[PDB]
Symmetry: C2
């Protein structure tokens, strides 16, 4: 069951997290160039919304609605993870203006986050970006929901991720 892009298999490195696992820590970069780790979000449920890029010419409007809905649930932060630099993150149509939606870039630690989460694309045009996934963590960073989207172009099961927080 390789992930595909336009139906074409791509290679991913690392092992995708299982429900019940302790989430791997990270050092991602916020839109003000500071480092973000799991401790930066202590006490909150976290939605890791992992996307190859949030800087596409056309807005992923459905992702904006999901980001808004999840972040409006009790004690929840949505962490939008991608290789996009913080300079681009300040313009993301899916995050701008939304409280408790926080952009977090992989650029400073390279492939570390993606590899730790089994979303490190290593072939084709997306080589060096994250694959598409949604991983929900509880306050103590136990994985309560995890989806590696089989086709990069497809929408995640946002309903399942939201329901995991209810």
């Amino acid at each position: 069951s390789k992930v595909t892009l336009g139906g074409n298999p791509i290679d991913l490195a690392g092992t995708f997290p299982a429900v019940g696992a302790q989430a791997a820590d990270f050092k991602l970069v916020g839109k003000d160039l500071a480092d973000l780790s799991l401790a930066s979000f202590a006490g909150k449920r976290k939605v890791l919304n992992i996307v190859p890029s949030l800087d596409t010419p056309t807005c992923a409007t459905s992702t904006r609605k999901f980001n808004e809905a999840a972040s409006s649930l009790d004690n929840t932060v949505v962490i939008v993870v991608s290789a996009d630099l913080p300079f681009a993150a300040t313009r993301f149509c899916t995050t701008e203006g939304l409280a408790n939606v926080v952009t977090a870039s992989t650029f400073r630690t390279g492939r570390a986050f993606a590899n730790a989460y089994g979303v490190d694309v290593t072939s084709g045009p997306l080589n060096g970006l994250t694959a598409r996934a949604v991983v929900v963590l509880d306050a103590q960073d136990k994985v309560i929901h995890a989806e590696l989207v089989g086709e990069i172009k497809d929408e995640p099961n946002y309903d399942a991720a939201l329901a995991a927080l209810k």
Copy 2:
């Protein structure tokens, strides 16, 4: 008395010393190769530009709405010269190139991203910032290569917020 010329101090950001990894190239050296990513997500290396003079315009980020006219004039002038390509190197993803202030309307300027190979380019060129807010970006530099990839001009800009000596870089191609 005679006073020895000072070895270049640490690059600064807003006057603040920052740490750089790698060794910045000297004039006369053969340029290190690289695998950078173009606007179409394909790989670019020195072989992509075989036999051309190359300007590597190395920038922490190109993704800003406002920029120096001198930078644009330099990019245009160098790209207009015979057998010359201007390659603008940064960590910005190719997706952001639509917003690159300094390359807007200059179709021959080639954007080349470090994202796929991480710190490899920056470390090979001695511009790998490892401290402060620019940690993981390239420092500011201009490196000019001749048609056989020998370094003919190289400036590691002393202060990130300052402009390179574009006049010197351009004049090296005459």
